Design a binder for these strands. Structure first.
Lengths: 10, 10, 10, 10
DNA sequence: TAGT
DNA sequence: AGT
DNA sequence: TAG
DNA sequence: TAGT
DNA sequence: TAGT
DNA sequence: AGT
DNA sequence: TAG
DNA sequence: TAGT
């Protein structure tokens, strides 16, 4: 996720 | 930092 | 730091 | 001393 | 007293 | 002086 | 009473 | 935010 | 450096 | 850590 | 070469 | 599978 907590997605 | 981006500190 | 130049940390 | 713990002296 |  |  |  |  |  |  |  |  995020970053942070990529995306999703990418 | 955070986490993220601990604290600081700890 | 150190001392000298505490820790880090403490 | 040092610095630290200048020189001495200077 | 000097002088990180 | 030495996130 | 930092050295 | 810390602790010679 | 410690510490999602 | 966060199909 | 995250912060 | 993915991409601070």
């Amino acid at each position: 996720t995020x970053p942070g907590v990529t995306x999703p997605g990418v």
